[model samples]
Target chain A: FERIAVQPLTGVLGAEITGVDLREPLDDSTWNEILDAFHTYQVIYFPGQAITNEQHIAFSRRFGPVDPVPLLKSIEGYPEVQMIRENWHTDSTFLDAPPAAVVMYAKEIPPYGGDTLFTSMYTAWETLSPTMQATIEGLNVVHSATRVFGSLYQAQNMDVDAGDRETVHPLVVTHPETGRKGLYVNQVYCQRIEGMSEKESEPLLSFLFAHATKPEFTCRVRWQEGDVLVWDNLCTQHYAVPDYAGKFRYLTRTTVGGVRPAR
Target chain B: QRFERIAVQPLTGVLGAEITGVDLREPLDDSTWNEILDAFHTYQVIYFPGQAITNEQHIAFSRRFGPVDPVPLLKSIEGYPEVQMIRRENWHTDSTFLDAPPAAVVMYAKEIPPYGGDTLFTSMYTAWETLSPTMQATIEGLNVVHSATRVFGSLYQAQNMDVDAGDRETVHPLVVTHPETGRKGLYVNQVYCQRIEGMSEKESEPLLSFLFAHATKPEFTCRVRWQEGDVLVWDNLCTQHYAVPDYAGKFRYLTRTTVGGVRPAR
Candidate 1:
């Protein structure tokens, strides 16, 4: 842990890490320390990291397999590098095995817009009353790519293939590494709780979605060029602010694959 | 205009946003005021935290939207007649009993309970959008009667306040198009709306009752827990608000200023 300096962003989740250059190769002990910091903080920021596309890909690979984003085009030559627009979501939850972590680097950011907001699912779950915590403890939810990839793409006039891909994951997921319980469902990907009617699921899901992202459980990260941010998708949610519309705000993304979610 | 002077962070997908980096007491330039106007229309409700402004500053800032409408039947700060002190519990748009209801409202929290007393706002735009197409068609051309006699007059008599609101009543479109955004929203609320125009109470109950219930669904709402210095601004045309009354036996003080608008039309 001494290899890097860390400053917590808020009382809840996020932290800023310094004292280590991401471009250069890291020793086993330093990598292990960084991994521990990632699990503890849930999201970590590396400010002023002037890393290249190759460096970004290499740094992301240290955590796990870097996968290309589905239903979106990658950068001109980098298959693993993609861009994210505005929405609140966890990465690729429609997949049977969603990404464990996401690495996002700001290539360019608007002067005043395009700030990313992050929320801690751990705080969201822990903040719930005992009755609700127990009620949703063992519940499962269905995640689908159809809404965002299908309807949204069609609305934007994008030529892309968005198949009917859906998967079931626990509504309350227990983190495999930290042994922490966190809410896994999101407004974008998770459609409904399993075995319940959409009408029946709507109220609870709506309340949970709203409760999970309250300001007390969240933090906002103002982006700067050459900044690299990493977050654990298994226990966090992020929203991309689109106030920068008509302005050129670009960022590259890479996701590290993880195992199937379970209670 | 770009939001260089203030940053707008939305509270949720539907309704509210938090505007930071500018104080309400300071004089704003055209660029900053334009950005604030854009955010007010876009978010429906935007709030500023840590704005400890005086009554004069509150009225001065609110005047940017339009002329501040004089509030009748409510007590105003002594020196500032345009600033009305208000604390009401129930969901409704402001002053719907008038021909030209306020287009917007600005509220500044002067004092607050340690906990509770949060205000909830609902997006009537979403309420209108979420209705079934058949329901939308049914309400498109209809009008509803809003009167203050039921809520305000009754309360005023109970409190023995010298105010005459007994004969105040007006008709607004069931579905109104926002004058600026052109977005349609449900215009009826349970607080002041009596019934659909030209219909018996029994006949209007089923439809109006259904809409009153639907307009305030949890999905279309956002709650703002107030701090002493927090200032909240909301579009009265496209949104409705409720002051939570759970703060009984606790002190909660706030001043309100309203911006006048045209008579609503479908």
Candidate 2:
């Protein structure tokens, strides 16, 4: 197919792709069209794709290597397929080379809630004042998995040590594919500015975190059991709504490996 | 005309203004009321802090712009039948299911918790203005079907109020031009708006859903943390409000009087 039927979910970052089945193998032309939509929209959604785990991995491999998330349990058979049940975050920024993209498949969706919201970092960066854009242009932030992942294991009584899972990345990064700049730090995993004290860094980070996730820069995705979502982690963030309290909401995600982010 | 009784302090770049140095209890002079009206038109939502007024005073003040549209379901305060006690927490415009929803609402906080329970107002004017040309053209002439069922259908059962609960639907333009300002604003909301007129539920879901989310963007919104004496009034024709329910288990109370309005048109 020369063009996949891609309709924008919102003016911001999400697009829905129709007239294509994930179960079927993609020809080079079709795969390139999908890649074009992925780069343009930052997040592309495929509704009602009843694909198997192998099919999910095969499609994810088109982007790059299927990188498995650390310290998270996957479904019994596939290590690369992990469930997300947390707050807003891009996948694995704590890693020195954070995953470039994530392919999430909704396995069992809740009846009413558990919608995921996606925010565009490109819009977030563009909306800031010129002074604000220039001020933090070259700054680096400390990203740590211990605070987010360590507490989860600790609460579950599992003996998991997250001490070494920390890295530093620039606050603003140019997308390797699109060459567009985006706000790279996320509320989760980003600890603080590289050299500033906690007190000094707290206010700025708080403002940026709040500003970056403004509704204008975001779109929401209501999930169905057979839905699949592919997003560029470098330019987007996803928030898994915990509103479906006590209800079963399960999704499996696969990540493609990325190189160290360039400023 | 030069002598002023109030000052307009804008809350944010988009929607709200705080009108200081005015007393709602006293009858306003023509100049004072005209300035207030101008601010209301320009800002779309305005508030007055530290005004401890009674129900009579609130109803009197709300009538300056237009006559009071009494609550159809919610109980009214004693002695002042027009002033309704607002209790629920949701994002809504006032009664869009009616043939003529109110032009605006005047809410005076009587009691509040120590913290939380902020009301967020989003600019529907900007919501319409900021849309891409393609989207603007797509929705400009469309009409939306609004119903009371989404909000008030279960109210009688839940609250046990002595009122008949039945669904009533009304069709309103997707983009309504403000009567006074002549500015276009996206009119559909989360609670009362059901679907686009003449479109099936499946066909209207995506566009209406997108509009509902797009209409409440943070850049076009301002949060009002209520104080006991604060009085807020918003243009219902061009704004939608959300009540934050963070102060659960805490007593929060307010009284409202709605100003009568004409049917919305494109």
Candidate 3:
């Protein structure tokens, strides 16, 4: 498509793309257009794509190298297809400098429920007080995979030692792609502010969680069967709402290009 | 009356602007003073940074707005008796307990904490405009009993307070219309407003709490970070301000000069 439509999901962040088919290889110019939108908007959506699992992975490779979805259960047939089915959330936050970006495709979706929420960390940092912002400077944050994603392993009596080792990421990290400063902690995986107990960091952490996800900074994506979404994982957080339990919700995810957050 | 040299930077979309370029230490021309008043009446709060002036200069510049009125209770600066010495306290309108309270209040920060002494100001016009139509109607005509006794008693102990008989209590309308702007604003505040008249304290507490929270939402407010020479001038009739207690043990001091205003009518 020569021209693509970019519709905003919220007042501050998120945009939806229309008029492109992921089934065919995107012309170089069209691909550049999409990449520019992805960097500018942080998260961009392509609804009702006819692309197969192989095609989705191939298209994502242009943005950056594809990394295996660390710590999540992969699909049986393909390792590249990070099968984000029901009950799996983004615990990959515990990774050294998590994936730079992610492109997700919906394979089997429910008729009514199962929506995912994406929030902008830039807006989150902007709304805070200079005192609160300065207070959090150079603070160490301890992220644990065992705390959130490791629960599934513990439930099945599998070992959680690999997940509990703790990955230390700074509370405020500069995004390598955009060079924008953002709050890197997540509500699920990041358990405690480093060197401080849960009781001590509880107030600050609770506030960060609430401020990061305020309605103005978030966008909701309702899954249609073939919808594809490319999100810059370095500066945003995603939550897969466990709403559609009875009906099946299936999505394949792939991580593209990343670098150690330029702290 | 043309002055293009003043610097005005908006602190927030709704209210507050940091003004510089023209210093109050020198005499202001009619145009610059009018230009400052233009933003002052509209935004409700104005800040002047990096000002160095004597007590007499503060009073001379203050009289440009109106004749200075004597503060009822608080101690004034040694040489300038009209200037009230402000330590700090809860969210409130200035001197609403008076039958004719101060209309405009200007505070010059002489000393402040290292990183935390910031003042929060919210637009009463915004608080009223954003409310549900139903809630606005319910409280429009209601009157609330405001008092110096309630806030001063809870805020700090002052052995020399003039909190005698009728001086501490007065009833102001829940919503007041500003004479200059001819716009309505929420007159209720977190401090001093004891209870809505006719309703028992039990019946009024829940509504009062919700209104306070609603008025002070992040979208309707702005925080002014203070430096030693920063001067904040705000409209007391159409807005409410709070002193953040993030700096507790640290010493902070400011001198305020207020002009007495007429009683607000519904």
Residue A135, candidate 2: alpha-carbon lDDT: 99
lDDT agreement with native, every candidate: 0.83, 0.81, 0.76
Please tell me what DockQ candidate 3 reaches: 0.03
Winner of 1 and 2 under lDDT:
1
lDDT of 2 by residue, A1-263 (tens): 35588877655577889888999998889899899999988999899899999999999999989966765777777888877655468987887888899998998876545657788999889989999999999899998776665654356564245543568999999999889999987877888899988788899998888778765566667678888889998999888655445777678889898789889
TM-score of candidate 2 against the unseen true structure: 0.53
Better of 1 and 3 by TM-score: 1
The residue-by-residue lDDT of candidate 1 on A86-203, one tens digit each, is 4568887888888899899988876555567788999889989999899889899988876776655457653234334668999988898899999888988878899998999999
Candidate 2 chain B has its poorest 10 consecutive residues by lDDT at B156-165
Interface RMSD of each: 8.9, 16.3, 15.8
> Candidates' DockQ values?
0.04, 0.02, 0.03
Candidate 2 regions exceeding 4 Å error are A84-86, A151-165, B1-266
- Model 3 chain B weakest 10-residue run by lDDT: B154-163
Ranking of models by TM-score? 1, 2, 3
Report the error of model 3 at residue B17, Å: 0.5
In candidate 3 chain A, what residue range of length 10 has the lowest lDDT sum?
A: A84-93
The true-versus-predicted C-alpha distance at residue A173 of model 2, in Å, is 0.7
Fraction of native contacts (fnat) of each candidate:
0.00, 0.00, 0.00
